[PDB]
Amino acid sequence: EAEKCTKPNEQWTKCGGCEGTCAQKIVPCTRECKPPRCECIASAGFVRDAQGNCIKFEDCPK
């Protein structure tokens, strides 16, 4: 059971730093994964808004 965070979206991830966007569910990345910590999750369907804000894909701008 991976500890969960308090705010939505931001959830436990074993590899942060890289993620997805409203245009690229998965961004190409090498062995550059930030340490394990609460953050966004592309494997789930969360994207990062231009405001560097992790939010569901449905919460994307029109």
CATH code (residue 55) = 2.10.25.10
Residue 61 tokens, joined? 């701008």
**CA gap 36, 14 in Å, rounded:** 4
Experimental method: NMR
Short-list 24, 28, 23, 55, CA closest to 39: 55
- Residue span of the structural domain in which 14 resides: 1-62
With vertex at residue 8, the alpha carbon angle to CA 2 and CA 50, rounded to the nearest 5 degrees, is: 115
With vertex at residue 24, the alpha carbon angle to CA 6 and CA 42, rounded to the nearest 5 degrees, is: 30
Q: Domain count for the chain, please give it.
A: 1
> Quick check: 48 and 39 in contact, CB under 8 A?
no
> Quick check: 11 and 4 in contact, CB under 8 A?
yes
For 47, other C-beta atoms within 10 Å of its C-beta total 22
Beta carbons within 8 Å of 61's beta carbon, 6+ residues apart: 22, 49
